[model samples]
Target: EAETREQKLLHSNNTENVKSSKKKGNGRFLTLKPLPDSIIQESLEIQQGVNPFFIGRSEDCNCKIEDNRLSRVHCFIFKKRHAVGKSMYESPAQGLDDIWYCHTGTNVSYLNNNRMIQGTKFLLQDGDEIKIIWDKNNKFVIGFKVEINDTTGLFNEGLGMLQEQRVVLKQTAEEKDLVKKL
Candidate 1:
């Protein structure tokens, strides 16, 4: 019984260590704000991870845009771990800082400053701005930023926790809006 207990404790410690290490890196987020005047009235903060994250007009998407100009499945963003090997400069490693790629599902999407070719993946960068528009009149600015280290702690120690809080806050605000409507 003593040996079994010791093994269980060791296993638990290893799990905790893995979790801590996984949370050590900086997180990617899209800070989307409404333009000066448009149908997109609400602002949002979207979290991105290794798995694919989506953006669209539909509520089912990871990040929902309430504009009619957007398609049901507008775009998707994901972290690319393995390189295509087409470029000698790129290499693959375990959990290394991977590049982020955005694919436009609709016919039109813009990254940084130029219009991207439809259905093609475009590399994203810090301080980059994404513009998804069906027409010139209806569009929004979604700013991308990597939260590295802040006053909170080294290597954004509390970023995941803060992101959780932010998500809860957004849900609460949405719930209140629904209640007020009735």
Candidate 2:
């Protein structure tokens, strides 16, 4: 476990100014919002045990689409327990956070202009465009945006105002003393 020295610090940093959770291996928390109007009405979320979110035109899929051109399981998104940051040591199948990925089984999907290899998974990012087919139609261009719903981890510099004192006090040379009497 000596190798985990730096890894501990890495995890500790995110913990110092960190967010809240149910503990590691507990659940997945991610928001996948689709920009398309009819395919997906509103936003959906990913929970802990319920993973491998399937998307397609079938009613059996987790994320079903009503579009005609799409087939029964166009693509799938899953999560893997990846170590946080660049730590060489990974926890024993019980780590914090995860690396999300997606794949289009037999359909066409593009991420970063790189056409996805058939049945291959690609690492997803915050703002990803999953173009089902190489076309100009807006229907095929899916806006895959991953959102994190957590309280702000930002430091509150505004709290400094509470500790501030009067610059010119009665004991010292006051500002109004220049024009007024005691």
* Predicted candidate 1 versus true structure: per-residue lDDT over 1-182, tens digit per residue: 22443365454544455445465324544444544444455455545443355566766656776556566546544443433336455543334333233444555555545454444444444434456554544444443333322222222232332212211011122222321121
TM-score, cand. 1:
0.50
Q: What is the TM-score of each predicted model, taking all chains together?
A: 0.50, 0.50
Question: What is the TM-score of candidate 2?
Answer: 0.50
Error of 1 at 85 (Å): 5.4
Sliding window of 10 residues with minimal summed lDDT for model 1: 163-172
Instruction: Give a tens-digit lDDT track for model 2, residues 1-182.
Output: 33443464545534443564335323435455665633454555655414455555565555654555455555555444433346576543344334234444455444445465334454443434444333357544554545434212211211212233312111112211221111
Clashing pairs in 1: none
